[PDB]
Design a protein around this nucleic acid. Structure first.
Length: 343
RNA sequence: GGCUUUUGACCUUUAUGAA
RNA sequence: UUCAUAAAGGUCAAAAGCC
């Protein structure tokens, strides 16, 4: 990798030069999605349109990224309605996209992949370059959050819906975006670095969603660093060390839900007993981004384990950078991590 | 020392949709 | 009164690049 060959001391320059998105493309994309939101709301009433995905979370990389545009509709009054009103809503959105694109944003080509995701209309905006692109997922959702920690009823009702894990993740996009986007700038730079490492591994399927590594990075920094200023190499080394320990990973946050409601609390306990890694979306307790052996964490671990023999993990005269230390992080004597740290 | 960029929070406006 | 997206201006904070 170019990442590997970059000395640890030059990592901030690598992030700035290779990983941070192109300002020009970001703006063109922003006004495009702004105009699409405009066309959708101007015509089921649109209550609210919020931005999620890597772009909305603040974790988009240069040269290819994803975005989610969540369209909250007043025709949904229960979670199960999104599943019920799915084909017909998405049908209307396709017509809206056609209308919208009759006034195209000048620097972008509109294309469509195969529709992989039920409950979403996916399309791509690519630059003329063609050095940058955004895979957009347009997702109708029920506005359970209204207009702040959610009342526990928000999540007990979710459980009563009988939904699949993360099936209604879009409903909580505002919370998810706030969790990741409202963070010290350098932490977000580290996230970009981690995601870039992940992307290069992928190029060289069925791996964990990228969002899983965003959470793991936030976990690493919260347990081992917590400062606005720190070194990227050590953070990266810490994250890769956690990945090697995937069988011991059990990570969650109580920012949006907790144990105080018996129903929600009892579900949280069950989620935490699932095959590791378990990494619960802080916005949606039903969405496990670890998910046991479902995803090939082993392949990520295999690459992590052998990649330390590189300039990006070396300072001075070949002194290996050290993983951060702290409550949730690899310990010298211990084989486990003591996860979940809260329990 | 100089130069430029990114990201938040907050304040003052504006458009649109909504409660 | 509030919420959302987009835009204009301002204050503050953190990080980063080059010389």
């Amino acid at each position: 990798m170019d990442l590997y060959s970059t000395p640890a001391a030059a990592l901030d320059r690598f992030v700035a030069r290779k990983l941070q998105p192109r300002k020009e493309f970001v703006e063109k994309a922003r006004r495009a999605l702004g105009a699409l939101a405009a066309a959708l709301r101007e015509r089921p009433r649109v209550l609210k349109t919020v931005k999620g995905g890597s772009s909305g979370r603040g974790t988009a990389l240069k040269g290819g990224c994803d975005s989610e545009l969540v369209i909250f509709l007043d025709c949904f009054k229960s979670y199960v309605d999104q599943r019920a009103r799915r084909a017909e809503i998405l049908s209307e959105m396709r017509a809206s996209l056609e209308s919208w694109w009759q006034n195209p944003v000048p620097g972008l080509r509109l294309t469509f992949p195969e529709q992989s995701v039920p409950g979403a209309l996916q399309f791509r905006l690519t630059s003329v370059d063609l050095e940058d692109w955004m895979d957009v997922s347009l997702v109708p959702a029920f506005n359970v959050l209204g207009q702040v920690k959610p009342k526990p009823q928000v999540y007990s009702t979710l459980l009563n819906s009988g939904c699949q894990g993360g099936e209604h993740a879009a409903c909580f996009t505002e919370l998810r975006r706030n969790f990741v986007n409202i963070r010290p700038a350098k932490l977000k730079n580290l996230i970009l670095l981690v995601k870039h490492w992940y992307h290069q591994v992928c190029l060289q399927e069925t791996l964990p969603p990228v969002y899983a590594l965003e959470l793991l990075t936030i976990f690493a920094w919260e347990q081992g660093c917590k400062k606005d200023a720190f070194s990227l190499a050590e953070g990266l080394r810490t994250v890769l060390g956690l990945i090697q320990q995937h069988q011991h990973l059990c990570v969650f946050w109580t920012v949006n839900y907790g144990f105080e409601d018996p129903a929600v609390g009892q579900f949280l306990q069950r989620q935490l007993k699932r095959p590791r890694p378990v990494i619960l979306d802080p916005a949606d307790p039903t969405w496990d981004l670890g998910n046991g052996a479902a995803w090939h964490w082993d392949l990520l671990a295999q690459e992590a384990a052998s990649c330390y023999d590189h300039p990006c993990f070396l300072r001075g005269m070949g002194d290996p950078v050290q993983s951060w230390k702290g409550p949730g992080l690899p310990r010298a004597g211990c084989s486990g991590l003591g996860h979940p740290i809260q329990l």
